Design a protein around this ligand. Structure first.
Ligand SMILES: CC(C)=CCC/C(C)=C/CC/C(C)=C/COP(=O)(O)OP(=O)(O)O
Length: 239
């Protein structure tokens, strides 16, 4: 267990760099940003937002099980563990957002520009908030249609970062399960991919580094258990 906590903590440290840096800078999101960088950021984000959220979890689990090389009986358990891992992560994210009631960077701008209180905006039904955001943004035209539609779709609170929990958890599961087999390429790729998603969430005016630094911390604490259980129940990572 001691190892799982250190291993994943090293990977957590590497992901934490990006939001800690974006935090210290005191960077504040602005609209109609670098068009080429926003399309690139959004597509990175598209690897994690549903339905592609399930596809990625599956593709990743498929590659994970393939590396770990478990039996049919163990494979089943490895899926149940990882599925639970990513599902507890998103379940934590919700029973926090609703309690902290933090607004999103696009919402603060959209409601400040339409001189509508952000607190009264969040008083509304998530359905009618999406109805409002579709109608208010249609007046902007400066914002691209891919992002404009993604905004209506999302709405809701910002603290902590859901995408950066899915993505951070998978890069952390890579250090927690594929580092004893020493599969560096996967660990490195998944770290960069998760970091890009964390980057993408700031770039599209959706989250604060506060959400990312806390979301990485939760993903770590959850993965450090999930990978421990996976070792005890499924079997050793190493033969
Ligand atoms: C197979 C399996 C169990 C898959 C799990 C996939 C899953 C539940 C993905 C979450 C995708 C999503 C729509 C998040 C919203 O995050 P957010 O807007 O609340 O957070 P953020 O924008 O601040 O990052």
């Amino acid at each position: 267990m001691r190892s799982i906590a250190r291993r994943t903590a090293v990977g957590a440290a590497l992901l934490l760099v990006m939001p800690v840096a974006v935090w210290i800078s005191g960077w504040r999101w602005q609209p109609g940003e670098q068009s080429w960088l926003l399309k690139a950021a959004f597509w990175v984000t598209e690897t994690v937002t549903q339905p592609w959220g399930v596809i990625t979890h599956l593709i990743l689990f498929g590659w994970f099980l393939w590396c770990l090389r478990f039996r049919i009986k163990a494979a089943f358990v490895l899926f149940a563990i990882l599925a639970a891992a990513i599902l507890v992560g998103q379940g934590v994210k919700s029973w926090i957002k609703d309690k902290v009631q933090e607004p999103r960077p696009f919402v603060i701008w959209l409601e400040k520009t339409h001189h509508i209180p952000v607190d009264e905006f969040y008083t509304l039904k998530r359905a009618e908030r999406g109805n409002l955001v579709k109608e208010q943004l249609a007046e902007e035209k400066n914002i691209p249609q891919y992002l404009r539609s993604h905004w209506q779709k999302e709405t809701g609170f910002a603290f902590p970062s859901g995408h950066t929990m899915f993505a951070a958890s998978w890069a952390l599961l890579a250090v927690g399960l594929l580092w004893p087999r020493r599969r560096t390429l996967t660990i490195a790729i998944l770290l960069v991919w998760a970091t890009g998603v964390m980057g993408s969430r700031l770039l599209l005016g959706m989250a604060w580094p506060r959400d990312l630094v806390v979301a990485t911390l939760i993903s770590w604490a959850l993965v450090a258990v999930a990978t421990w259980l996976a070792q005890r129940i499924c079997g050793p990572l190493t033969p």
